[PDB]
Design a protein around this nucleic acid. Structure first.
Length: 324
DNA sequence: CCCGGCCGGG
DNA sequence: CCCGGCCGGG
């Protein structure tokens, strides 16, 4: 329901050649519009040639013009968009987005939801997170290009990810108690909060212990399969996804009979396979995600030693199940 | 060229 | 089962 949620729920499926940026590109522009006090609903014709150039540069699509058709209809059933004069459009391919002719012929004014147009105009902070969300989840390298073009530069200048929540160091008693505040799931240590940003949870088993790998800057985090050989699925897949592109994630830590707290952003810098003990207490094959903390998601902020280490990493699983 | 059916991921 | 961008063939 919560606009914050729904924008977070916008996860395009993982096609082979990346996921489809069409739907985020639109939402990003549409926030840039509401920030720039543009009109709530706008006609198809005008939106089309306004977004299409962005879609070509920033959604790495060939025909930006065509591109817009899909999200322009689709985003409605993501409960974020709305389209007056729906009935009048003539549809194709069973229920899917209608024909280019009915779009050009009817020139339907489409735009953002009611409450959402109000919320963005009235509260910049909510507008700030949402573009920070997408900016993080889907772009996250921020080539100088889009800052200005999408909106936005004025909105998120300085440190963009400032707008995201939680803040660093925020503290909660339960795993549950985090969930009330940020959603996602109590569950695997690997997951995404309502905002659609990945979060990894480290529950310390012993006092005067934490995950730091000795004689090193980094943190050893264990894949989230609970009792037998772990699999590149769910949480582990998510890690591998982030690892590929060099995207960062929230590292949560509970000291031990201590409260959870959002201790740092971190980036996967190595993926390792190890023997370890299940919850069942028998040996098993498990993932070792090696994390390097960083100040924020903004690459500009990352120290060189981290950058070297991603450069250096092959991206490939290292199987140590041959000697331990 | 832009209907459609076709992919293939949830 | 479901749908959203892909891409064939009219």
């Amino acid at each position: 329901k919560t606009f914050h949620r729904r924008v977070g729920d916008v996860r395009p499926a993982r096609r082979a050649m990346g996921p489809a940026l069409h739907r985020p590109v639109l939402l990003l522009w549409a926030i840039g519009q509401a920030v720039a006090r543009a009109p709530r609903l706008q006609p198809w014709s005008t939106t089309r040639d306004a977004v299409a150039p962005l879609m070509e540069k920033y959604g790495q699509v060939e025909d930006g013009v065509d591109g817009v058709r899909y999200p322009f209809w689709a985003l409605v059933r993501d409960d974020l968009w709305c389209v007056e004069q729906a009935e009048e459009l003539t549809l194709t391919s069973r229920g899917r987005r209608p024909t280019l002719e009915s779009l050009n012929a009817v020139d339907p004014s489409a735009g953002l939801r009611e409450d959402d147009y109000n919320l963005l105009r009235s509260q910049p902070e909510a507008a700030a997170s949402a573009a920070a969300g997408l900016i993080a989840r889907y772009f996250h390298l921020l080539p100088a290009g889009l800052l200005e073009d999408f909106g936005l530069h004025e909105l998120l200048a300085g440190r963009w990810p400032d707008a995201l929540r939680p803040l660093l160091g925020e503290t909660f008693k339960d795993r549950d108690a985090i969930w009330r505040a940020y959603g996602g799931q109590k569950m695997a240590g690997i997951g995404c909060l309502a905002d659609g940003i990945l979060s990894a949870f480290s529950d310390d088993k012993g006092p005067y212990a934490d995950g730091r790998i000795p004689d090193t800057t980094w943190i050893a985090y264990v894949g989230d399969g609970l009792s037998g050989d772990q699999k590149l699925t769910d949480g582990n897949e998510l890690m591998a996804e982030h690892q590929a592109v060099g995207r960062a994630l929230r590292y949560w830590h509970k000291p031990f009979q201590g409260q959870w707290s959002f201790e740092t952003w971190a980036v996967i810098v190595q993926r390792r396979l190890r023997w370890g003990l299940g919850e069942d207490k028998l040996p098993r094959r498990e993932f070792l995600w090696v994390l390097a903390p960083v100040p924020s998601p903004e690459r500009e902020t990352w120290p060189p030693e981290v950058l070297e280490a991603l450069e250096a990493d092959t991206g490939e699983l290292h199987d140590d199940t041959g000697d331990y």
